[PDB]
Design an enzyme around this catalytic site. Sequence first.
Site, PDB file in Angstrom:
ATOM      1  N   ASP A   1       0.959   4.234   1.576  1.00 41.61           N
ATOM      2  CA  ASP A   1       1.344   5.030   2.736  1.00 41.61           C
ATOM      3  C   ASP A   1       2.657   4.592   3.419  1.00 41.61           C
ATOM      4  OD1 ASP A   1       0.573   2.737   4.155  1.00 41.61           O
ATOM      5  OD2 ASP A   1      -0.645   3.841   5.602  1.00 41.61           O
TER       6      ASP A   1
ATOM      7  N   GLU B   1       3.159   3.263   6.146  1.00 41.16           N
ATOM      8  CA  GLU B   1       3.030   1.939   6.755  1.00 41.16           C
ATOM      9  C   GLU B   1       3.394   0.856   5.727  1.00 41.16           C
ATOM     10  OE1 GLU B   1      -0.797  -1.012   7.273  1.00 41.16           O
ATOM     11  OE2 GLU B   1      -0.136   0.202   5.539  1.00 41.16           O
TER      12      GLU B   1
ATOM     13  N   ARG C   1      -6.849   5.208   3.018  1.00 38.63           N
ATOM     14  CA  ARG C   1      -6.172   5.962   4.084  1.00 38.63           C
ATOM     15  C   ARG C   1      -5.671   7.255   3.465  1.00 38.63           C
ATOM     16  NH1 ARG C   1      -2.095   1.907   7.271  1.00 38.63           N
ATOM     17  NH2 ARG C   1      -3.669   0.772   8.516  1.00 38.63           N
TER      18      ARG C   1
ATOM     19  N   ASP D   1       0.850  -1.198   0.000  1.00 38.46           N
ATOM     20  CA  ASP D   1       0.000   0.000   0.000  1.00 38.46           C
ATOM     21  C   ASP D   1       0.885   1.247   0.000  1.00 38.46           C
ATOM     22  OD1 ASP D   1      -2.257  -1.638   0.065  1.00 38.46           O
ATOM     23  OD2 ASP D   1      -2.727  -1.235   2.169  1.00 38.46           O
TER      24      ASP D   1
END
Length: 534
Positions: free
Chosen positions: A85, A87, A293, A83
Amino acid sequence: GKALVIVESPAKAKTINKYLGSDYVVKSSVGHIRDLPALVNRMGVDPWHNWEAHYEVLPGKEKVVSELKQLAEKADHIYLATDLDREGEAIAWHLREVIGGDDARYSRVVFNEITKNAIRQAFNKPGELNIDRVNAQQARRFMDRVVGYMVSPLLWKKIARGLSAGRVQSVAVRLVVEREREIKAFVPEEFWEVDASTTTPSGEALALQVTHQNDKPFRPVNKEQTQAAVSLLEKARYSVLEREDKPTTSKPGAPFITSTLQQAASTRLGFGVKKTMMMAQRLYEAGYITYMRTDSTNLSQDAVNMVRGYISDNFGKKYLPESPNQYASKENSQEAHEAIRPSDVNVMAESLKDMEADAQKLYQLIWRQFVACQMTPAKYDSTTLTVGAGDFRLKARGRILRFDGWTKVMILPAVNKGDALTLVELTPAQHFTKPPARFSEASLVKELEKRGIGRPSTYASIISTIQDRGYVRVENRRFYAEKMGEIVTDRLEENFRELMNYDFTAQMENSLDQVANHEAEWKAVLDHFFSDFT
Ligand SMILES: Nc1ncnc2c1ncn2[C@@H]1O[C@H](COP(=O)(O)O)[C@@H](OP(=O)(O)O)[C@H]1O
């Protein structure tokens, strides 16, 4: 033995694989492959030795790592497709550091949508692992680790075993506790309101509220002052001093971002915060929506053109704005550049194939918000009647819908200025001010966003955790601080006042973003964090 693409879930692997050719082997590594575990030994991080960390492959995932190793070497090039982001950036970093090899052996592909065009452009112009992002994630990780391992113990000692303090969840509990104490301390204020039922020259009924007396706001505080006003109003002559007619408009809300999606999903669909993000991720991984997000209300040019295209065909001219409706730019504290929207406006919620009923309801909400944000304003004819009765001033507001605009995808009687109104009946009413409203799941998320306490990746976790740990409970869709939460909060404010400070929490979150955006270095940010904290 061709090219290896690593993603974090089976669902994401099945979708991305649809847009990757034969020379691409897509493999998933379920979640975190590596992570943190005397005081420094347990934390797996050393605040006293320039944040030396000790990572170790998750318990039992020793197989996954090997399946990857002998598969990576067998590979030409390795694509880290986690993903977008920070994270996902750290997950990519951990994968690279565990599989090993030279850096030129890896690439980090970035997409905010799992579609044919998105995956093509992502693998076309692949990038490199962004160390700032990884360091931002690590810093957040270390901060939470330090707080939890150094504060939870005091809660075990002074209150009870099993209790745990969180860097952000602690402040979130304070927000609910303060509100609880604000409500209990509230002292109702008595005040009266006088209403007047009247008749128009043609007979139609009209209700008015007394607003001014002798040109000063009308606010009787007791039965005595009200009776006086009522007595004068009983013998006064009522005539229309003014009829203000103004065209009013209502604009559609901006396309969703994480916090607004959770708010509307909770209020309009009764979905809990954790459920929304779970359905949202389900939708995103199946390629139906953009990354979930984000705090960007920006919309790409292609998405804007396509929905405007949809609006013309299905609603017509009058619903299509002159120029597109812009809401915010691509630059924001977080990595996502776009808002939460469907990947294809032509795909209705009813056509999703592998989705549960709730994921469809959410897509429906996402879809409608997105289409509406590019439609025209709703137009209303507003009517404000100002009436005079002796020394008093009365008013009545009215509104009738002229054009539904964006609301398609989601009355006072007639009298002219100077008209005489026949007094039918005066209604004096005693009232009492109300205490502050309690937090709802939606207003708490908004609160967390407004104070800079939450981020797109923590909103849900923060609200779920405080309920699980028993510091707050939800009843009738409203938040109640539990005695345990009040007790933990007071003890935390005694021993760690800085931690429990709203501005401290928001600053640390901003400092994390600064690390992510190369405006601060992580060890220095951690040093300042640990310094304020102790
Ligand atoms: N405005 C300022 N100008 C110069 N030094 C400052 C400063 N604010 C803080 N410092 C110093 O920076 C270090 C980190 O402190 P802080 O976390 O509060 O910012 C401290 O020194 P030491 O590192 O020698 O202890 C402190 O005295």
